[PDB]
Design an enzyme around this catalytic site. Structure first.
Site, PDB file in Angstrom:
ATOM      1  N   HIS A   1       9.513 -40.293 -20.061  1.00  0.00           N
ATOM      2  CA  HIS A   1       8.762 -40.173 -21.679  1.00  0.00           C
ATOM      3  C   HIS A   1       8.025 -39.571 -21.386  1.00  0.00           C
TER       4      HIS A   1
ATOM      5  N   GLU B   1      30.672 -52.090   1.778  1.00  0.00           N
ATOM      6  CA  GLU B   1      31.570 -52.149   0.990  1.00  0.00           C
ATOM      7  C   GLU B   1      31.330 -51.121   1.579  1.00  0.00           C
TER       8      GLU B   1
ATOM      9  N   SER C   1      13.383 -35.571 -21.405  1.00  0.00           N
ATOM     10  CA  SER C   1      15.079 -35.074 -20.301  1.00  0.00           C
ATOM     11  C   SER C   1      15.075 -33.497 -20.612  1.00  0.00           C
TER      12      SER C   1
ATOM     13  N   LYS D   1      26.917 -41.546 -28.498  1.00  0.00           N
ATOM     14  CA  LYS D   1      27.438 -41.144 -28.078  1.00  0.00           C
ATOM     15  C   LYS D   1      27.232 -41.980 -26.448  1.00  0.00           C
ATOM     16  N   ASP D   2      25.857 -43.403 -26.543  1.00  0.00           N
ATOM     17  CA  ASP D   2      26.098 -44.289 -25.248  1.00  0.00           C
ATOM     18  C   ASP D   2      26.934 -45.084 -25.593  1.00  0.00           C
TER      19      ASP D   2
HETATM   20  C1  HEM Z   1      18.919 -49.021 -11.646  1.00  0.00           C
HETATM   21  C2  HEM Z   1      18.740 -47.467 -11.066  1.00  0.00           C
HETATM   22  C3  HEM Z   1      18.216 -46.693 -12.827  1.00  0.00           C
HETATM   23  C4  HEM Z   1      18.117 -46.973 -14.027  1.00  0.00           C
HETATM   24  C5  HEM Z   1      18.283 -47.937 -14.760  1.00  0.00           C
HETATM   25  C6  HEM Z   1      18.253 -45.621 -14.090  1.00  0.00           C
HETATM   26  C7  HEM Z   1      17.633 -45.005 -15.874  1.00  0.00           C
HETATM   27  C8  HEM Z   1      17.894 -44.109 -16.129  1.00  0.00           C
HETATM   28  C9  HEM Z   1      17.686 -43.766 -17.888  1.00  0.00           C
HETATM   29  C10 HEM Z   1      17.812 -44.374 -18.246  1.00  0.00           C
HETATM   30  C11 HEM Z   1      17.252 -42.230 -17.413  1.00  0.00           C
HETATM   31  C12 HEM Z   1      17.225 -41.019 -18.733  1.00  0.00           C
HETATM   32  C13 HEM Z   1      18.755 -41.276 -19.519  1.00  0.00           C
HETATM   33  C14 HEM Z   1      19.346 -39.916 -18.300  1.00  0.00           C
HETATM   34  O1  HEM Z   1      19.182 -38.741 -18.558  1.00  0.00           O
HETATM   35  O2  HEM Z   1      20.560 -40.067 -17.646  1.00  0.00           O
HETATM   36  C15 HEM Z   1      16.709 -41.911 -16.195  1.00  0.00           C
HETATM   37  C16 HEM Z   1      17.041 -40.609 -16.037  1.00  0.00           C
HETATM   38  C17 HEM Z   1      16.818 -40.348 -14.912  1.00  0.00           C
HETATM   39  N1  HEM Z   1      16.147 -40.603 -13.194  1.00  0.00           N
HETATM   40 FE1  HEM Z   1      17.407 -42.561 -13.307  1.00  0.00          FE
HETATM   41  N2  HEM Z   1      18.113 -44.440 -13.506  1.00  0.00           N
HETATM   42  C18 HEM Z   1      18.131 -45.619 -12.197  1.00  0.00           C
HETATM   43  C19 HEM Z   1      18.397 -44.471 -10.549  1.00  0.00           C
HETATM   44  C20 HEM Z   1      17.887 -44.004 -10.697  1.00  0.00           C
HETATM   45  C21 HEM Z   1      17.542 -42.507  -9.125  1.00  0.00           C
HETATM   46  C22 HEM Z   1      18.469 -43.309  -8.250  1.00  0.00           C
HETATM   47  C23 HEM Z   1      17.191 -41.435  -9.479  1.00  0.00           C
HETATM   48  C24 HEM Z   1      17.347 -41.020  -7.941  1.00  0.00           C
HETATM   49  C25 HEM Z   1      17.919 -41.313  -6.439  1.00  0.00           C
HETATM   50  C26 HEM Z   1      16.926 -41.323 -11.210  1.00  0.00           C
HETATM   51  C27 HEM Z   1      16.333 -40.498 -11.344  1.00  0.00           C
HETATM   52  C28 HEM Z   1      16.570 -39.821 -13.050  1.00  0.00           C
HETATM   53  C29 HEM Z   1      15.818 -38.303 -13.166  1.00  0.00           C
HETATM   54  C30 HEM Z   1      15.799 -37.417 -12.253  1.00  0.00           C
HETATM   55  C31 HEM Z   1      15.756 -38.694 -14.757  1.00  0.00           C
HETATM   56  C32 HEM Z   1      16.414 -37.445 -15.701  1.00  0.00           C
HETATM   57  C33 HEM Z   1      17.123 -36.604 -15.572  1.00  0.00           C
HETATM   58  C34 HEM Z   1      17.283 -35.648 -16.565  1.00  0.00           C
HETATM   59  O3  HEM Z   1      16.568 -35.645 -17.533  1.00  0.00           O
HETATM   60  O4  HEM Z   1      17.601 -34.587 -16.419  1.00  0.00           O
HETATM   61  N3  HEM Z   1      17.532 -42.377 -11.359  1.00  0.00           N
HETATM   62  N4  HEM Z   1      17.547 -43.006 -15.783  1.00  0.00           N
HETATM   63  C1  HEM Z   2      21.673 -55.500  -8.992  1.00  0.00           C
HETATM   64  C2  HEM Z   2      22.577 -56.829  -9.464  1.00  0.00           C
HETATM   65  C3  HEM Z   2      23.268 -57.208  -8.283  1.00  0.00           C
HETATM   66  C4  HEM Z   2      24.274 -56.522  -7.672  1.00  0.00           C
HETATM   67  C5  HEM Z   2      24.251 -55.572  -7.756  1.00  0.00           C
HETATM   68  C6  HEM Z   2      25.205 -57.463  -7.366  1.00  0.00           C
HETATM   69  C7  HEM Z   2      26.337 -57.517  -6.335  1.00  0.00           C
HETATM   70  C8  HEM Z   2      26.567 -58.252  -5.925  1.00  0.00           C
HETATM   71  C9  HEM Z   2      27.598 -58.534  -4.914  1.00  0.00           C
HETATM   72  C10 HEM Z   2      28.359 -57.558  -4.324  1.00  0.00           C
HETATM   73  C11 HEM Z   2      28.072 -59.933  -4.662  1.00  0.00           C
HETATM   74  C12 HEM Z   2      29.419 -60.433  -3.663  1.00  0.00           C
HETATM   75  C13 HEM Z   2      30.386 -60.571  -4.931  1.00  0.00           C
HETATM   76  C14 HEM Z   2      31.465 -60.949  -4.121  1.00  0.00           C
HETATM   77  O1  HEM Z   2      32.341 -59.929  -3.649  1.00  0.00           O
HETATM   78  O2  HEM Z   2      32.805 -62.010  -4.274  1.00  0.00           O
HETATM   79  C15 HEM Z   2      27.368 -60.872  -5.530  1.00  0.00           C
HETATM   80  C16 HEM Z   2      27.527 -61.977  -5.899  1.00  0.00           C
HETATM   81  C17 HEM Z   2      26.828 -62.893  -6.404  1.00  0.00           C
HETATM   82  N1  HEM Z   2      25.588 -62.646  -6.698  1.00  0.00           N
HETATM   83 FE1  HEM Z   2      24.678 -61.122  -7.215  1.00  0.00          FE
HETATM   84  N2  HEM Z   2      24.491 -59.081  -7.812  1.00  0.00           N
HETATM   85  C18 HEM Z   2      23.436 -58.885  -8.548  1.00  0.00           C
HETATM   86  C19 HEM Z   2      22.377 -59.423  -9.294  1.00  0.00           C
HETATM   87  C20 HEM Z   2      22.936 -61.185  -9.303  1.00  0.00           C
HETATM   88  C21 HEM Z   2      21.851 -62.074 -10.128  1.00  0.00           C
HETATM   89  C22 HEM Z   2      21.332 -61.599 -10.938  1.00  0.00           C
HETATM   90  C23 HEM Z   2      23.008 -63.851  -9.350  1.00  0.00           C
HETATM   91  C24 HEM Z   2      21.811 -64.412  -9.833  1.00  0.00           C
HETATM   92  C25 HEM Z   2      20.830 -64.513 -10.723  1.00  0.00           C
HETATM   93  C26 HEM Z   2      22.889 -63.295  -8.861  1.00  0.00           C
HETATM   94  C27 HEM Z   2      24.755 -64.256  -8.708  1.00  0.00           C
HETATM   95  C28 HEM Z   2      25.345 -64.201  -7.273  1.00  0.00           C
HETATM   96  C29 HEM Z   2      26.235 -64.397  -6.769  1.00  0.00           C
HETATM   97  C30 HEM Z   2      26.175 -65.827  -6.954  1.00  0.00           C
HETATM   98  C31 HEM Z   2      26.860 -64.501  -6.206  1.00  0.00           C
HETATM   99  C32 HEM Z   2      27.874 -65.471  -5.083  1.00  0.00           C
HETATM  100  C33 HEM Z   2      29.248 -65.270  -6.438  1.00  0.00           C
HETATM  101  C34 HEM Z   2      30.001 -64.290  -5.606  1.00  0.00           C
HETATM  102  O3  HEM Z   2      30.878 -63.417  -4.402  1.00  0.00           O
HETATM  103  O4  HEM Z   2      30.482 -63.607  -6.340  1.00  0.00           O
HETATM  104  N3  HEM Z   2      24.234 -61.056  -8.288  1.00  0.00           N
HETATM  105  N4  HEM Z   2      25.748 -59.931  -6.050  1.00  0.00           N
HETATM  106  C1  LIG Z   3      15.336 -44.080 -23.446  1.00  0.00           C
HETATM  107  C2  LIG Z   3      16.837 -43.193 -23.288  1.00  0.00           C
HETATM  108  N1  LIG Z   3      16.592 -41.944 -22.901  1.00  0.00           N
HETATM  109  C3  LIG Z   3      17.139 -41.013 -23.397  1.00  0.00           C
HETATM  110  C4  LIG Z   3      18.844 -41.187 -22.324  1.00  0.00           C
HETATM  111  C5  LIG Z   3      19.387 -39.855 -22.461  1.00  0.00           C
HETATM  112  O1  LIG Z   3      19.106 -39.138 -22.313  1.00  0.00           O
HETATM  113  C6  LIG Z   3      17.911 -38.714 -22.875  1.00  0.00           C
HETATM  114  C7  LIG Z   3      16.600 -39.321 -22.605  1.00  0.00           C
HETATM  115  C8  LIG Z   3      18.845 -42.357 -22.431  1.00  0.00           C
HETATM  116  O2  LIG Z   3      20.468 -42.837 -22.749  1.00  0.00           O
HETATM  117  C9  LIG Z   3      18.184 -43.739 -22.705  1.00  0.00           C
HETATM  118  C10 LIG Z   3      19.164 -45.327 -23.342  1.00  0.00           C
HETATM  119  C11 LIG Z   3      18.597 -45.527 -21.788  1.00  0.00           C
HETATM  120  C12 LIG Z   3      19.138 -47.041 -22.045  1.00  0.00           C
HETATM  121  C13 LIG Z   3      19.604 -47.191 -23.150  1.00  0.00           C
HETATM  122  O3  LIG Z   3      20.498 -48.759 -23.437  1.00  0.00           O
HETATM  123  C14 LIG Z   3      19.533 -49.735 -22.198  1.00  0.00           C
HETATM  124  C15 LIG Z   3      18.869 -50.807 -23.042  1.00  0.00           C
HETATM  125  C16 LIG Z   3      18.102 -51.421 -22.028  1.00  0.00           C
HETATM  126  C17 LIG Z   3      18.855 -51.865 -21.236  1.00  0.00           C
HETATM  127  O4  LIG Z   3      18.845 -52.427 -20.348  1.00  0.00           O
HETATM  128  C18 LIG Z   3      17.150 -52.533 -19.299  1.00  0.00           C
HETATM  129  F1  LIG Z   3      17.084 -54.016 -18.579  1.00  0.00           F
HETATM  130  F2  LIG Z   3      17.717 -51.880 -18.990  1.00  0.00           F
HETATM  131  F3  LIG Z   3      16.386 -53.352 -20.104  1.00  0.00           F
HETATM  132  C19 LIG Z   3      20.257 -51.411 -21.178  1.00  0.00           C
HETATM  133  C20 LIG Z   3      20.524 -50.452 -21.858  1.00  0.00           C
HETATM  134  C21 LIG Z   3      20.237 -46.259 -23.993  1.00  0.00           C
HETATM  135  C22 LIG Z   3      19.273 -45.393 -23.579  1.00  0.00           C
END
Ligand code: HEM
Ligand code: HEM
Ligand SMILES: CC1=NC2=C(COCC2)C(=O)[C@@H]1c1ccc(Oc2ccc(OC(F)(F)F)cc2)cc1
Ligand SMILES: CCCCCCCCCCCCCCCCCC(=O)OC[C@H](COP(=O)([O-])OCC(O)COP(=O)([O-])OC[C@@H](COC(=O)CCCCCCCCCCCCCCCCC)OC(=O)CCCCCCCCCCCCCCCCC)OC(=O)CCCCCCCCCCCCCCCCC
Ligand SMILES: CCCCCCCCCCCCCCCCCC(=O)OC[C@H](COP(=O)([O-])OCC(O)COP(=O)([O-])OC[C@@H](COC(=O)CCCCCCCCCCCCCCCCC)OC(=O)CCCCCCCCCCCCCCCCC)OC(=O)CCCCCCCCCCCCCCCCC
Ligand SMILES: CCCCCCCC/C=C/CCCCCCCC(=O)O[C@H](COC(=O)CCCCCCCCCCC)COP(=O)(O)OCCN
Ligand SMILES: CCCCCCCC/C=C/CCCCCCCC(=O)O[C@H](COC(=O)CCCCCCCCCCC)COP(=O)(O)OCCN
Ligand code: HEC
Ligand code: HEM
Ligand code: HEM
Ligand SMILES: CCCCCCCCCCCCO[C@@H]1O[C@H](CO)[C@@H](O[C@H]2O[C@H](CO)[C@@H](O)[C@H](O)[C@H]2O)[C@H](O)[C@H]1O
Ligand SMILES: CCCCCCCCCCCCO[C@@H]1O[C@H](CO)[C@@H](O[C@H]2O[C@H](CO)[C@@H](O)[C@H](O)[C@H]2O)[C@H](O)[C@H]1O
Ligand SMILES: CC1=NC2=C(COCC2)C(=O)[C@@H]1c1ccc(Oc2ccc(OC(F)(F)F)cc2)cc1
Ligand code: FES
Lengths: 378, 240, 74, 56, 39, 110, 378, 53, 54
Positions: free
Chosen positions: A200, A270, A204, A226-227
């Protein structure tokens, strides 16, 4: 005057998501950020529900999950959602990182490194989640992988045994992985808050790579609609899997309870870790393979310094575009290789793919940037 | 050994995207488990209740439950007794532990059958072609004894004797009990056992496809409307 | 609002001394004991009365429970 | 036009637009469920318990 | 005077009360024909 | 206006249906599982209990007493003290059959 | 210029905790906010560790906890800390609320109602945590209390059975309470973030009740040192319990596994709910008792409207001060009563204490405000 | 005695720590308290003067 | 199943195979486990001591 602009809480939400000046021209590739947020919320909800029914004792765990799928009301759909959910999250993650690389979004350094950390953190999360059911793959997967930290000289053996909480992956490891897997998404939410906070500051990037201040538009309603459209498409996709093909992206050995006496014919993690498995498997030496595996991920952090082009985005960089897609295809290949047993010809395909990967990031695409510069008389 | 023969793909009545399991086939397939497989193979995740609404009425299922002897928890004296099964009991383990199962099978442990469709690549196609795939070794092959030749198994040497052949059992409905017919029916039951949800999921699939057919062009139309302001706009540079 | 536009103050002089020029505990008991007494005399008639009544209702009711659990000659 | 009739009757007042949507969702839920159900149960004639249960 | 000469939220809050009634009744699931009238 | 707001209104209806579904599913997940319903109820054979004798059973993990009652028991419990009971409850309204009294076998005290 | 003032992340921390203009004269009673934060962090850490070792199956649960205390390394100190921790949290909470009432801090409405919600949320958390060991009190406590929602006419029975996930507090209830107990502290952290966000709009009240803009001081170092001192004192206290008296604030029945067939001689919840138990127990009728119990807490929300005094703080309000301490002592009495069996004389002491409580908040202290006003010729 | 130990194996370790906690707190409480007074001395000492013309 | 001599790793053995067995043997009363007994009775050592000698 107006509440959306004043009120301490509403102000933030307004500034963040309503009146935020967005570029006119961001493409579908900018959908992924919002979608990742959804992925994260999705996992937490489905996760929370599962956790109301699951147990993390070696003895009860496999059956508690199947109990969700047989006897808990709608437990099946929830479970398959959380599992395909994890796949959708990694798709969104890799798409998102793709856009970063191609459009030079990584110039936003703070945003970018936070992002790298988000990636690592989601990786840890999904690794430990996959163990939770206590299937054959879960168990033998978790064993092989954690064992790599044994290759750390001096401390390796001790370190892996301390993670485990014993002499193998056993009761204590599963119970702690449950704990970690629960709290990690929470920490991911905060890191993501911060991820945005830094974004922010700059607003972007866009596909031209050229500053867009002369043509911004209020986020709402252009990007709200659009989102939503994008989220529908994510849901279309997620549910296609859950309802038509719930097991498409998984391994069947994970329907066979974990058995410390019988090792599965091919051990794989995986799919979303296969490229890194294949890099690791390419190196003869075990610590070599570890450091390669780590570098295949941490290299993300270096890419900012490897930028040579005078242009930010690859839109106008033909040579760089070809190389980019080469890297993408190579990662498809690394994934294929990582799903394959260690035999000819795959051993050698993998070695080549591993070389190609690092070669592209560290030498070829830097060079291309520079060749392009000379082609433009700068 | 380390070779192939991956199963061909049989046109199951439930292969189709929106196609449910044949419930009559499940009923027959249960019979095949009950009379044939249950001597060696457990199925710990099915109870008598689970048959209700699927292939058996509630009291039919009760009949089937009453037919088995199950241990029950400590009485007054603090002793274990046997009783007739109820709906609430899980399908009984043929041996009290895995080691007992091994002793009884020349050292091989028969896998539980709950998930078997799901925990083997090829699922129904695999299992069907397994049961119907037993043949006499090819020239040059000699297997250790009490391990049989089956081209569909890994390594081709399986510790299971061919459990299936014509009239191996009698069908409630009286369907011709040919070997292939009983392998089909047992497979159908084995799919259902591994994935009770198969039908519900497929119903939802349909409703999800329908709703998305509505909602995707709808929202897409909403998008275009808002954005029309921008799509239409014309730019003019006008310096003096 | 931060230091710089909190409020408007005119004509007030603040004189003070570095901590390293001064004692941490100037006349700690000789001034402090009297001050603490003063502080307590000030509040005890507001604060103590309720707690007295608590102690009494608790004394009485605990012993009323005692008595009622005994037998009486009848 | 039909749409004109609808706009003035239902959609102009936002209170009314809402009342429309809740009521219509009600009839849509019932209608869509019933119709899709019949679509599935005709696609899967004979194979469902509810098709064979008369026998037991 | 001028509040009371409001009370123009009375017919609008009438329509919002039906939204609240009908909304709770939809989310929760006899005498409405067709819908649930034929379970 | 009508046309374009129809799209909006339509859209919302579809989403409301879907959302209703998603939500209520999650909700029933929390309601008792099929295995807990299978322990909901217990069946007892009345022709398998003799007249005057109690017969215990296990219900929700607790002792559950059924008792065949004689006409001695029925009449002697009919005209007991209406009011004077510690817990005032007449007999024709603690049971549904005169000759059958069903009771959970746990002392209310401790 | 200066990083602490510019950098997006550091700015916030600076504005929040370093350069924040604090009043010169806030007393020890303003320590509690920081201390509550510590309590919250403390519970999360100790909690996380416990959760690496605990299981939420009826059969394993009691023993898994004792296993922590016997066989896990330092598991004992961790466990007792998390338990005395919960007490320290409620002490801090009640002190904090005390200051609110006496000094008229509740005039900060948004801050205040958030706070009420924090209280409710911590209450839910600790209620469900106490069930996790599956002792006699845990079980019978959770049963009695959840059953009150049965008194809700129409829906009561259904509602309580849906919470339980069956026909009594059993396997499904414990597993879900584990889940809830884990995620709730996280939500408490966010609510607390917001709690502060609104406080930072007004800055702090002080004991005079008079605006302090003419005499503010930078938070650091005055209040950094002072909070630390307070945290030491909290730690002194916490550890005094854990290391000298770990069981002082608990009930012994919680060392006896939960047994659905044998009801304990006196059923009580934890001490921090005793005042509300005693109010509930005073009412003959069961729905009456429920609504009283709810009102004994939710009334907090009304106190802002019941303020009559022209002065904000009770410092200069003698009559109000007496009444305040009356309320405090009454709550000590309500607590005593709630720990007592339902016999003479306690039934009647409790009834009186319950009357006194509501009487003070809704009628006496409003009045006193007004009497004081007249004594001052306004 | 055995039944106490059985119920609370930690009894001795806990009591050892108690001692070390009491000792450390004996050090740390006056120490930090002294730190507090030092910083605050600037403020405690200060004298105020109102001086309108 | 077989019997063996105990090791360090074995828990002190249950005198009966379940609670119902314990009851039959004690005129319908179940002797409490003694693991926590000091802790799960008000008075602890003082209680138990004065019980045995009382
Ligand atoms: C939980 C994982 C992530 C979340 C929730 C997340 C969330 C977001 C959001 C909401 C935006 C703005 C919307 C967009 O431009 O697509 C954004 C932008 C961005 N994120 Fe992430 N992001 C994640 C992981 C990552 C990772 C792994 C990278 C790089 C390794 C990354 C780098 C960026 C960059 C560079 C931008 C700016 C893009 C632009 O304005 O051109 N993010 N992310
Ligand atoms: C990034 C967020 C998360 C990811 C990527 C994730 C990923 C996973 C994956 C890959 C499994 C194995 C699924 C399967 O093949 O059975 C799993 C299982 C599980 N996850 Fe998560 N998880 C997330 C968040 C959470 C959270 C917040 C909770 C609980 C608070 C949770 C509870 C569980 C439980 C109880 C299982 C066992 C049941 C099952 O195998 O489906 N997960 N999760
Ligand atoms: C802020 C924002 N800026 C830009 C773009 C696109 O590029 C311009 C900048 C976006 O697309 C967005 C955006 C990001 C998330 C979203 O919906 C949510 C909100 C909250 C949420 O849970 C959480 F845990 F993350 F809080 C999960 C989805 C809507 C819009
Ligand atoms: C392996 C996994 C994969 C990896 C990813 C997975 C990750 C998870 C998912 C995450 C998703 C991320 C993407 C985010 C995008 C968000 C939206 C966005 O930003 O903009 C949208 C983005 C571009 O938006 P735009 O405004 O068009 O921008 C145009 C540009 O300016 C350029 O302008 P232009 O003028 O040059 O454009 C030319 C135009 C024209 O070129 C074309 O290709 C024409 C063909 C059009 C097809 C039919 C049109 C449908 C409605 C139009 C009515 C006239 O083409 C387009 O507009 C391109 C967009 C896509 C075309 C539309 C969809 C084709 C499907 C064909 C179905 C046919 C049947 C329709 C009947 C529907 C009823 C069931 O488009 C897409 O990405 C498509 C999304 C919308 C599609 C909805 C249409 C309905 C389709 C049928 C539904 C059936 C449901 C199930 C079966 C039902 C059984 C009953
Ligand atoms: C049932 C549960 C309870 C509910 C709550 C539980 C909740 C959890 C806890 C949460 C805590 C929240 C409180 C937050 C407060 C944060 C700090 C704050 O804001 O300011 C502090 C607040 C007031 O600060 P201040 O700068 O004095 O403000 C003065 C006002 O302007 C007024 O000025 P003034 O001039 O009118 O003041 C007169 C002055 C004077 O009146 C007095 O009472 C004089 C008596 C002083 C006692 C000894 C002084 C120690 C060092 C001074 C050296 C000269 O009195 C004071 O300064 C009042 C403060 C307390 C007096 C100091 C402690 C007395 C303990 C006696 C021990 C004797 C042996 C000492 C040897 C140490 C070595 C082991 O004071 C306190 O609340 C006391 C905290 C500091 C005490 C540390 C002293 C060391 C004590 C011995 C340690 C032994 C350890 C274990 C055994 C060891 C075995 C080896
Ligand atoms: C540890 C992390 C490792 C490194 C990360 C690697 C990332 C993995 C890759 C996923 C795909 C990322 C997408 C990159 C950005 C897309 C760029 C793009 O759309 O380029 C298009 C061609 O599109 C097209 O042709 C679009 C077709 C999309 C192809 C699908 C990708 C295949 C997935 C492979 C999975 C392993 C040309 O667009 P522009 O130059 O913007 O010009 C627009 C018109 N003027
Ligand atoms: C659902 C929630 C229900 C309602 C909440 C009720 C809160 C529970 C109460 C806890 C104690 C709260 C403390 C209130 C603020 C303290 C006010 C105070 O310090 O007053 C002192 C007297 O102090 C003193 O005399 C200080 C002695 C402190 C007494 C200990 C309290 C006993 C605990 C009882 C536990 C149940 C006088 O101070 P000031 O008027 O500021 O004047 C200072 C000198 N000029
Ligand atoms: C004891 C004589 C058996 C009866 C009756 C049945 N099965 Fe069996 N089965 C048995 C053993 C000892 C094994 C292990 C084989 C090995 O090589 O170790 C098996 C295995 C299976 C498998 C697994 C195939 C695989 O890929 O592992 C299946 C699918 C299987 N059995 C099915 C099955 C069915 C459907 C039966 C009744 C129709 C049946 N078995 C009977 C021993 C015995
Ligand atoms: C407000 C914060 C918290 C409070 C008030 C709290 C309160 C409690 C309470 C009262 C108990 C019962 C303690 C006992 O007597 O045995 C308990 C137990 C437990 N809590 Fe928490 N808790 C909190 C946060 C957490 C968190 C974040 C976790 C895990 C992530 C957690 C995990 C546990 C576990 C595993 C137990 C069972 C072990 C035990 O009984 O000590 N707690 N909690
Ligand atoms: C998890 C629980 C809570 C935390 C972490 C918390 C945190 C804080 C913090 C850090 C402060 C500022 C420091 C202080 O003035 O003490 C504060 C102030 C305040 N809190 Fe809380 N609080 C909590 C619960 C509550 C509750 C339950 C209430 C009221 C019911 C409340 C009302 C207030 C008020 C009114 C202030 C302002 C005090 C003033 O400036 O005079 N808080 N809180
Ligand atoms: C092309 C020459 C003509 C004769 C050979 C014709 C066969 C086709 C060419 C490949 C020959 C196979 O010979 C070789 O075997 C080894 C062992 O698995 C594999 O090669 C691999 O060996 C080990 C595997 O642990 C690695 O250290 C090495 O880095 C890698 O090259 C390849 O499969 C192939 O390079
Ligand atoms: C003071 C009169 C002289 C004769 C009595 C002397 C004994 C001391 C006075 C109290 C007498 C006891 O008589 C009474 O018993 C009842 C029943 O437990 C209790 O009183 C309570 O009764 C029920 C309890 O369920 C409540 O509905 C009622 O609101 C409450 O007053 C008191 O303990 C006492 O008011
Ligand atoms: C901000 C603040 N304003 C004022 C006062 C005193 O009155 C003036 C205003 C304070 O005392 C404080 C305060 C608050 C917390 C704190 O230490 C933490 C921080 C974070 C934490 O974890 C958490 F989860 F909450 F984030 C736990 C303790 C230090 C200082
Ligand atoms: S009289 Fe039965 S438990 Fe008290």
């Amino acid at each position: 005057t107006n509440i959306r602009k004043s009120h301490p809480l509403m102000k933030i939400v307004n500034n963040a998501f309503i009146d935020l000046p967005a570029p006119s021209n961001i493409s579908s590739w900018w959908n992924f950020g919002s979608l990742l947020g959804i992925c994260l919320i999705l996992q937490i909800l489905t996760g929370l529900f599962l956790a109301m029914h699951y147990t993390s004792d070696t003895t009860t765990a496999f059956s508690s999950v199947t109990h969700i799928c047989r006897d808990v009301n709608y437990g099946w759909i929830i479970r398959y959602m959380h599992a395909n959910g994890a796949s959708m999250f990694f798709i969104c993650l890799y798409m998102h990182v793709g856009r970063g690389l191609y459009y030079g979004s990584y110039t936003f350094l703070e945003t970018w490194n936070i992002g790298v950390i988000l990636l690592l953190t989601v990786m840890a999360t999904a690794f430990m989640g996959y163990v939770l059911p206590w299937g054959q793959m879960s168990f033998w997967g978790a064993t092989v992988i954690t064992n790599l930290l044994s290759a750390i000289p001096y401390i390796g053996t001790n370190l892996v045994e301390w993670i485990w909480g014993g002499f193998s992956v056993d009761k204590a490891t599963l119970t702690r992985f449950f704990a970690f897997h629960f709290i990690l998404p929470f920490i991911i939410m905060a890191i993501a808050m911060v991820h945005l906070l830094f974004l922010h500051e700059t607003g972007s990037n866009n596909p031209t790579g050229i500053s867009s201040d002369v043509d911004k538009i209020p986020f709402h309603p252009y990007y709200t609609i659009k989102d939503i459209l994008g989220a529908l498409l994510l849901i279309l996709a997620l549910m296609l899997l859950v309802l038509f093909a719930p097991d498409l992206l998984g391994d069947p050995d994970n329907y066979t309870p974990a058995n410390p006496l019988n090792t599965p014919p091919h051990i794989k993690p995986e799919w979303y870790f296969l490229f890194a498995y294949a890099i690791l498997r390419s190196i003869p030496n075990k610590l070599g393979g570890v450091l390669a595996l780590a570098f295949s991920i941490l290299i993300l952090a270096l890419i900012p310094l490897l930028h040579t082009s005078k242009q930010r985005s690859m839109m106008f960089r033909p040579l760089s575009q070809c190389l980019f897609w080469a890297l993408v295809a190579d990662l498809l290949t690394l994934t294929w290789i990582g799903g394959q047993p260690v035999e000819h010809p795959y051993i050698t395909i993998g070695q080549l793919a591993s070389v190609l990967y690092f070669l592209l990031i560290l030498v070829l695409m830097p060079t291309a940037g520079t060749i392009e510069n000379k082609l433009l008389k700068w | 050994s380390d070779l192939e023969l991956h199963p061909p793909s049989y046109p199951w009545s439930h292969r189709g995207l929106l196609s449910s399991l044949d419930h009559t086939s499940i009923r027959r397939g249960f019979q095949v488990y009950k009379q044939v497989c249950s001597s060696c193979h457990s199925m710990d995740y099915v109870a008598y209740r689970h048959l209700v609404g699927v292939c058996y009425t509630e009291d039919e299922a009760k009949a089937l439950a009453e037919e088995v002897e199950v241990q029950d928890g400590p009485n007054e004296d603090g002793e274990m007794f046997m009783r007739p099964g109820k709906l609430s009991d899980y399908f009984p383990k043929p041996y009290p532990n895995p080691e007992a199962a091994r002793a009884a099978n020349n050292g091989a442990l028969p896998p539980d059958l709950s998930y078997i469709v799901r925990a083997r690549h090829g699922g129904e196609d695999y299992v069907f072609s397994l049961l119907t795939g037993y043949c006499e070794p090819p020239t040059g092959v000699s297997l250790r004894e009490g391990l049989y030749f089956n081209p569909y198994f890994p390594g081709q040497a399986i510790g299971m004797a061919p459990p299936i052949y014509n009239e191996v059992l009698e069908f409630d409905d009286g369907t011709p009990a040919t070997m292939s017919q009983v392998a089909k029916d047992v497979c159908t039951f084995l799919r259902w056992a591994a994935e009770p949800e198969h039908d519900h999921r497929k119903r939802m699939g349909l409703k999800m496809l329908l709703m998305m057919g509505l909602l995707l062009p709808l929202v897409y139309a909403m998008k275009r409307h808002k954005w029309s302001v921008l799509k239409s706009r014309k730019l003019a540079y006008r310096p003096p | 609002r931060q230091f710089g536009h909190l409020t408007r103050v005119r004509h007030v002089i603040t004189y003070s001394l570095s901590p390293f020029e001064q004692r941490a505990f100037p006349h700690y008991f000789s001034k402090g004991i009297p001050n603490v007494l003063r502080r307590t005399r000030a509040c005890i008639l507001r604060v103590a009365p309720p707690f007295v009544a608590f102690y009494l209702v608790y004394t009485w009711g605990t012993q009323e429970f005692e008595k009622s659990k005994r037998k009486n000659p009848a | 036009t039909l749409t004109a009739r609808l706009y003035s009757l239902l959609f102009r007042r936002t209170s009314t637009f809402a009342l429309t949507i809740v009521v219509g969702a009600l009839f849509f839920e019932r209608a869509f469920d019933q119709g899709a159900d019949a679509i599935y149960e005709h696609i899967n004639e004979g194979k469902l318990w509810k098709h064979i249960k008369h026998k037991y | 005077r001028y509040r009371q000469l409001a009370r123009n939220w009375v017919p609008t809050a009438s329509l919002w009360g039906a939204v609240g009634a009908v909304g709770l009744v939809w989310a929760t699931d006899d005498w409405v024909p067709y819908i649930n009238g034929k379970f | 206006k009508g046309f374009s707001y129809l799209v909006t209104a339509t859209t919302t209806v579809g989403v409301a249906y879907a959302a209703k579904n998603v939500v209520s599913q999650f909700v029933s997940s929390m309601s008792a599982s099929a295995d807990v319903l299978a322990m909901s109820k217990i069946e007892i054979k009345l022709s398998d209990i003799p007249e005057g004798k109690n017969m215990a059973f296990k219900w929700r993990g607790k002792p559950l007493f059924v008792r065949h009652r004689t006409k001695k028991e029925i009449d002697q419990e009919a005209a007991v003290e209406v009011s004077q009971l510690r817990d005032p409850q007449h007999d024709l309204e603690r049971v549904k059959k005169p000759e059958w009294v069903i009771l959970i076998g746990v002392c209310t005290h401790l």
